[PDB]
Design a binder for this molecule. Structure first.
Ligand SMILES: N[C@@H](CCCC[NH3+])C(=O)O
Lengths: 291, 291
């Protein structure tokens, strides 16, 4: 039911690295007016890793407040500890977020059965719609289609963000399920295809800088208009590629700065996009008529 | 510079998950008696990611209490947040820890420059000897040899735990460092090889169950006695392989329990060793002469 273009929104920061509230505000508002269907707050793109547990709440809150029940808001609440994921998700519900996006425990390489217990534990512990999130490159673990299918049986595990970028594997996953649980693309570059094949939307990085263009791509692809999907997406294909020239959200945060929407702030270990990539990015934003 | 067998000690747990403090005390004591040269408290093998920050400090404190200055104690204090890492390293220092082990930020894929700035910051904020820790398979990031050689310039970055298991890569690491910082194997299977090549020690998982064996293996290898190193290590070579049949620390914990040294406790997402593996493990243990 949460469908379409879901922006994994960045957490804007001041030069000193403090959360720039106002700029955030302008973003949420801007997204809600440009077409964006929903927002993921404090996810990878929103630097969940470098924000204190209180900044998580405060940031999730500001966004829910500004949204004003207009679009659903999803809170990033994954962690590699189960007790702690349960806490974050609970706080997400209590803040009245519509859903929680939980990445697979990273770094500790839990087994498939563990991933199963992990997610089942959280689902039983909190009464909120949960979305699984697989992105092996970052986590060290790969939630198997099989396991995901196993979890689809739990009534409040309602979806999964597949960031593999592996299309065949994604179609297999969509078919293996039924509307048992939704599938969301996590790979901007292949998202249009995943959606043409059944995926219910795209938790996008690109949406941070091309919300209207991405809204239109998702609507059209979910509708199965392959021709128009390839064409609307083509006008922003390069972006998907170059917004990853360095680890997300590094490039997207600079792109935004090059749009006067946010400030250079970004927390270590992350760093401001390297000089070397800046012009190629400015160029990318022009070629695509973004600025 | 710490040399020898450095055990990545497990954090003993009671059935319900609480830290088994009595067992921990005895393990530490057993290690010093068996020949263990140093202990890494709350590292990966010690379930650092599922322990409370307070449990984290308490474990460090306890181990330093029991060791009673007889061996140096290394505290794992890595985090994917620079602020968080500094906080945790400051605490370890204040707790009396001889040095800290910091895994590269995981999940958020910082850049090489980012890894450099990350470690430089922690080094400048805390005056405690620091040891870098690279294990790409778990972190999603790979601290290159070039970056390690840069960080080796910094006065209090004394060493690097190389868990790649890529010996030729380790040969290049050690040759390029020109002694600026020590190198430790983070891969039990190849550890004796890295040491013969120049590595100062092994931050070992196997030492958890074969402390005296790994202790003489380390001494001999560091002494550059290639035949004694090979034949001593051969005795417990199957152990190095089977302690990873499932993600560490799942296997080692079960090993200790079969040795009747600890209870079955282990926190989620981690799970107790899958049934099918428990028998082959006991056989490995029996064959090795541990039971
Ligand atoms: N990198 C891991 C390997 C364990 C997982 C192998 N199945 C460690 O030694 O901490």
């Amino acid at each position: 039911t949460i469908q379409g273009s879901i922006v994994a929104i960045v957490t804007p920061m001041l030069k000193d690295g403090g959360v720039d509230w106002k700029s955030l505000e302008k973003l949420v508002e801007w997204h809600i007016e440009q077409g964006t269907n929903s927002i993921v707050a404090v996810g990878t793109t929103g630097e969940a890793s470098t924000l204190s547990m209180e900044e998580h709440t405060q940031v999730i809150k500001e966004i829910i407040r500004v949204a004003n029940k207009r679009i659903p808001i999803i809170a990033g609440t994954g962690a590699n500890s189960t007790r702690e994921a349960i806490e974050l998700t609970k706080a997400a519900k209590d803040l009245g977020a519509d859903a929680a996006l939980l990445v697979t425990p990273y770094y500790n390489k839990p087994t498939q059965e563990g991933l199963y217990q992990h997610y089942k534990a959280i689902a039983e512990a909190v009464e909120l719609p949960l979305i699984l999130y697989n992105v092996p490159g970052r986590t060290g673990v790969d939630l198997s289609n099989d396991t995901a299918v196993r979890l689809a049986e739990i009534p409040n595990i309602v979806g999964i963000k597949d960031a593999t970028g592996d299309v065949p594997r994604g179609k297999a996953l969509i078919d293996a399920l039924n509307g048992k649980m939704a599938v969301y693309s996590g790979d901007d570059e292949t998202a249009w295809e995943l959606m043409l094949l059944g995926a219910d939307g795209n938790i996008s990085v690109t949406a941070n800088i091309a919300p209207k263009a991405m809204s239109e791509v998702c609507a059209v692809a979910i509708a199965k208009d392959e021709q128009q999907a390839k064409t609307l997406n083509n006008k922003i294909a390069n972006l998907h590629n170059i917004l990853f020239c360095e680890s997300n959200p590094i490039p997207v945060k600079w792109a935004l700065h090059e749009m006067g929407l946010i400030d250079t702030g970004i927390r270590l270990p992350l760093t401001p996009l390297a000089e070397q990539y800046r012009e190629p990015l400015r160029n990318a934003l022009k070629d695509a008529g973004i600025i």
